[PDB]
Amino acid sequence: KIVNIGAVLSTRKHEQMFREAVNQANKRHGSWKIQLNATSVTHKPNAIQMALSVCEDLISSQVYAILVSHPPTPNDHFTPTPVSYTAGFYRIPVLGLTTRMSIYSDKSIHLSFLRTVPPYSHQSSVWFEMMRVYNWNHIILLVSDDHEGRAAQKRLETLLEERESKAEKVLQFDPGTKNVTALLMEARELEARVIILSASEDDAATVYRAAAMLNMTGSGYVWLVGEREISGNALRYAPDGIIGLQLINGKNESAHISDAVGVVAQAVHELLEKENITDPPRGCVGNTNIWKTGPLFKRVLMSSKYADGVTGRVEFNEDGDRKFANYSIMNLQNRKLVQVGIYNGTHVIPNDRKIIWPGGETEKPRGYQMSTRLKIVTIHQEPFVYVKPTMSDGTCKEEFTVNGDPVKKVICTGPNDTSP
Amino acid sequence: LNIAVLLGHSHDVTERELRNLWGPEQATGLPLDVNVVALLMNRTDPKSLITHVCDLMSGARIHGLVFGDDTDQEAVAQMLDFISSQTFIPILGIHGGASMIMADKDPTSTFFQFGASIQQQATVMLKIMQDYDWHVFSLVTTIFPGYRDFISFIKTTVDNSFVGWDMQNVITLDTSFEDAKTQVQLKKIHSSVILLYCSKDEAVLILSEARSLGLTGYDFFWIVPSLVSGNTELIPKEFPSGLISVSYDDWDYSLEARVRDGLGILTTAASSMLEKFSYIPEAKASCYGQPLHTLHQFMVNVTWDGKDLSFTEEGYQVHPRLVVIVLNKDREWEKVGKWENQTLSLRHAVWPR
Ligand SMILES: *[C@@H]1O[C@H](CO)[C@@H](O)[C@H](O)[C@H]1NC(C)=O
Ligand SMILES: *[C@@H]1O[C@H](CO)[C@@H](O)[C@H](O)[C@H]1NC(C)=O
Ligand SMILES: *[C@@H]1O[C@H](CO)[C@@H](O)[C@H](O)[C@H]1NC(C)=O
Ligand SMILES: *[C@@H]1O[C@H](CO)[C@@H](O)[C@H](O)[C@H]1NC(C)=O
Ligand SMILES: *[C@@H]1O[C@H](CO)[C@@H](O)[C@H](O)[C@H]1NC(C)=O
Ligand SMILES: *[C@@H]1O[C@H](CO)[C@@H](O)[C@H](O)[C@H]1NC(C)=O
Ligand SMILES: *[C@@H]1O[C@H](CO)[C@@H](O)[C@H](O)[C@H]1NC(C)=O
Ligand SMILES: *[C@@H]1O[C@H](CO)[C@@H](O)[C@H](O)[C@H]1NC(C)=O
Ligand SMILES: *[C@@H]1O[C@H](CO)[C@@H](O)[C@H](O)[C@H]1NC(C)=O
Ligand SMILES: *[C@@H]1O[C@H](CO)[C@@H](O)[C@H](O)[C@H]1NC(C)=O
Ligand SMILES: *[C@@H]1O[C@H](CO)[C@@H](O)[C@H](O)[C@H]1NC(C)=O
């Protein structure tokens, strides 16, 4: 008869905001006679003792849904995984609020890890929409990771299939090494200078150091990065004029927690509107009964439409993401984040500021060289392409025609025969 | 090394043989800290799992966990993946829900499972269908995840078929049963084998709809994998006569041999790692107040008791032992088919209808 809400939350002002939101969640959400109590955990350095305290708060209390709201994790793991896996044992989804990786987007490892934040494929879509403004076609892709890199490459190929075009060159290597200068030198001799980076913080710092040692901050270089490349030392090693992205009402913790409690409480009351109300079992002795209303709760949550929120109109898609995300296109002008544009879900509106690039003027970086190096291929046709061996070494004898036209020979590279 | 073994109540396997497995065995023990802790838990729950993690890892640095599950979910093994993501302890998936086949693992995780993947299981099922001369088949797949690789493997098999497999188009079920539009999809199925890839209760509903409409004849066969059928203890209602399941839940097969092969592979890995690096215990000590050498890409070339117990690149055995069971009229599941190293063995030549 008692209902406890699982909340991994420890900051006391957000504890008061959580208690106020729990008090407000039972006021106008119907005349149903259920009550909601809070259950919070404290700080631990590890994640296994955190998971122990969480699961002791979960299984021995017959919880409904879990909210994890710690983006400053004390370790470098950044894992909401154990609480989500604990609830996914009982087929219970967890609405995570911190991570945005594409390894959490897969429905094979994380079966029901839902979230109200979009992954980096939406940032790749914003980059593709910025390609549609200045008519960008040939791009260079550099991805260090492999978990999110396959999803980012699949989304980029999907967007280029929507354009019905092709990419120029993609790069996927092993992080940790420092011999990434030769790959950047091979990427220098391509047909374009548009650089797109999708990596972690240390890999972004490594490729920024490699670009600084090779002087890739000259004219025409397109610098368009996201969130992980403007944090930490990658913010320090970035050149002046690099373009990044900023979350609108994403770093604001209290309004995000209040909107998350509102969405979760509206989902719980929507599940309580219909029949087949089941509770998770205990874990003491001799009852291994599974939770039977898994697909029912999935049909409730995955097909839910919302209209309330301080951040904005939240709506869960087929992957459990955020629709119409407000972004801030930011510029790093002399180690200072300068607001140079904002982003609704359908259109980009720059402000009255100047978009200063590390290349030329405030327009798009002229990094197009697909006409200054053309590999002219031809076949040995008898009337069309006469191929003649040189006299001594690489010279062309200027033959004379009958109409006064000198034979303008070109120094080509001709083979003698085929492979047999 | 110190390896703790925990079991439940699957296949009437007790706990005293886990104590007897340490005494006369393990003669060539190159590590000196080789001890076992045999445990039993009545319920399957993550609370007791994290409790035994924080009580046994602090218990003289146990770097081995064996768990026996009796549920119908592979994500229980994903719980062990959290042991593989923080402490980086290699755990061998032995039997039950801790070793069921999922879609895509991660190379950074040191977790392993015992069994063949869904592509090799589909290869075994198509070898069964080729040996029984059942050419025309169907494919009914729901919106349950892990469906792209299976349908893609069937498409690449039919498009590169030496036999000429007549593949019916994919029957998709986006919603539940309505008997308005799915009835047309059920009436178009006139094949012999009706393939199914979904959950347990959805399979019960589809077989009940097929029984209520007369789609469960002798010509209409039903071949299911281990993910659709599940364990052999719980048998729900509305199952047609002629259900052939492919799984590994065998009653007379020794779980003691499974845990003995697991301990042999882990002690072989520890003995091969002792000759390379000195400090073999290098992991998280205890759950109170916070990798360099792992055993993920090191015990691939393992061989215990002469059997091919080597590891694949995805975290599976190279040649496991597949089980093919049938459903008779006596509401029982009897083992029929087993898989060899390279080819496929068939016990019953004359196939009953
Ligand atoms: C919340 O806690 C109070 C005090 O322990 C208790 O009286 C009340 O029943 C609880 N509400 C429910 C039903 O969860
Ligand atoms: C990079 O290459 C050098 C050889 O030029 C090699 O000695 C070194 O181990 C490599 N690793 C680094 C530092 O990235
Ligand atoms: C790069 O730029 C610096 C500063 O202008 C210059 O000294 C150096 O010769 C250039 N060459 C390299 C190392 O790429
Ligand atoms: C909310 O976030 C913005 C940055 O996006 C910050 O400037 C502002 O101070 C924050 N306000 C609150 C309520 O903390
Ligand atoms: C509740 O569950 C039962 C059994 O699964 C089912 O028959 C019934 O349709 C469900 N109720 C509703 C309204 O979905
Ligand atoms: C973005 O912010 C605007 C207000 O500036 C708001 O109307 C809108 O709901 C937000 N984004 C969405 C969900 O379109
Ligand atoms: C986004 O759209 C809202 C109207 O829905 C508008 O008020 C707001 O100014 C827009 N934001 C941008 C990108 O300027
Ligand atoms: C090219 O090949 C022929 C044999 O096919 C050989 O006799 C000749 O010396 C070679 N040199 C030329 C003309 O390129
Ligand atoms: C329950 O577990 C204990 C060990 O903790 C075991 O001794 C007992 O036999 C089990 N009982 C059953 C049958 O579940
Ligand atoms: C097995 O593979 C490892 C590398 O993972 C290698 O060092 C070792 O020599 C090989 N031989 C055995 C059977 O240990
Ligand atoms: C498979 O091969 C092993 C040797 O690696 C052998 O001991 C075993 O009997 C074989 N099993 C069969 C026949 O499937």
Swiss-Prot record, chain A:
Protein modification: NMDA is probably regulated by C-terminal phosphorylation of an isoform of NR1 by PKC. Its phosphorylated state is influenced by the formation of the NMDAR-PPP2CB complex and the NMDAR channel activity.
Tissue-specific expression: Detected throughout the brain, in brain cortex, cerebellum, thalamus and olfactory bulb.
Sugar-bearing residue positions: N37, N179, N215, N252, N276, N326, N344, N416
Disulfide pattern: C55-C284
Superkingdom of source: Eukaryota
Cellular localization per UniProt: Cell membrane; Postsynaptic cell membrane; Synaptic cell membrane; Postsynaptic density membrane
Extracellular topology ranges: 1-420
Function: Component of N-methyl-D-aspartate (NMDA) receptors (NMDARs) that function as heterotetrameric, ligand-gated cation channels with high calcium permeability and voltage-dependent block by Mg(2+). NMDARs participate in synaptic plasticity for learning and memory formation by contributing to the long-term potentiation (LTP). Channel activation requires binding of the neurotransmitter L-glutamate to the GluN2 subunit, glycine or D-serine binding to the GluN1 subunit, plus membrane depolarization to eliminate channel inhibition by Mg(2+).
Domain remarks: A hydrophobic region that gives rise to the prediction of a transmembrane span does not cross the membrane, but is part of a discontinuously helical region that dips into the membrane and is probably part of the pore and of the selectivity filter.
Family: Belongs to the glutamate-gated ion channel (TC 1.A.10.1) family. NR1/GRIN1 subfamily.
Assembly notes: Heterotetramer; the NMDAR subunits are modular and harbor tiered domains that function in concert to regulate opening and closing of the cation-selective ion channel pore. Forms heterotetrameric channels composed of two GluN1/zeta subunits (GRIN1), and two identical GluN2/epsilon subunits (GRIN2A, GRIN2B, GRIN2C or GRIN2D) or GluN3 subunits (GRIN3A or GRIN3B) (in vitro). Can also form heterotetrameric channels that contain at least two GluN1 subunits and at least two different GluN2 subunits (or a combination of one GluN2 and one GluN3 subunits) (in vitro).
Name of the protein this chain belongs to: Glutamate receptor ionotropic, NMDA 1
The species this protein was found in: Rattus norvegicus
Gene name for this UniProt entry: Grin1
Section of the entire sequence shown: 25 to 444 of 938
Swiss-Prot record, chain B:
Extracellular side: 1-353
Tissue specificity: Detected in brain cortex, olfactory bulb, hippocampus including the dentate gyrus, striatum, thalamus, superior colliculus, inferior colliculus, midbrain and cerebellum (at protein level). Detected in brain cortex, hypothalamus and cerebellum.
Subcellular location: Cell projection, Dendritic spine; Cell membrane; Synapse; Postsynaptic cell membrane
Protein residues bound to Zn(2+): H11, H95, E233, D249
Consequence recorded when altering D249 to A/H: Nearly abolishes inhibition by Zn(2+)
Disulfide bridge partners, by residue number: C54-C287
Glycan attachment positions: N42, N301
Domain notes: Contains an N-terminal domain, a ligand-binding domain and a transmembrane domain. Agonist binding to the extracellular ligand-binding domains triggers channel gating.
Binding partners and assembly: Heterotetramer. Forms heterotetrameric channels composed of two GluN1/zeta subunits (GRIN1), and two identical GluN2/epsilon subunits (GRIN2A, GRIN2B, GRIN2C or GRIN2D) or GluN3 subunits (GRIN3A or GRIN3B) (in vitro). Can also form heterotetrameric channels that contain at least two GluN1 subunits and at least two different GluN2 subunits (or a combination of one GluN2 and one GluN3 subunits) (in vitro). In vivo, the subunit composition may depend on the expression levels of the different subunits. Found in a complex with GRIN1, GRIN3A and PPP2CB. Found in a complex with GRIN1 and GRIN3B.
Function: Component of N-methyl-D-aspartate (NMDA) receptors (NMDARs) that function as heterotetrameric, ligand-gated cation channels with high calcium permeability and voltage-dependent block by Mg(2+). NMDARs participate in synaptic plasticity for learning and memory formation by contributing to the slow phase of excitatory postsynaptic current, long-term synaptic potentiation, and learning.
Family: Belongs to the glutamate-gated ion channel (TC 1.A.10.1) family. NR2A/GRIN2A subfamily.
Protein's name according to its UniProt entry: Glutamate receptor ionotropic, NMDA 2A
Biological classification of the source: Eukaryota, Metazoa, Chordata, Craniata, Vertebrata
From-to range in the entire protein, with total length: 34 to 392 of 1464
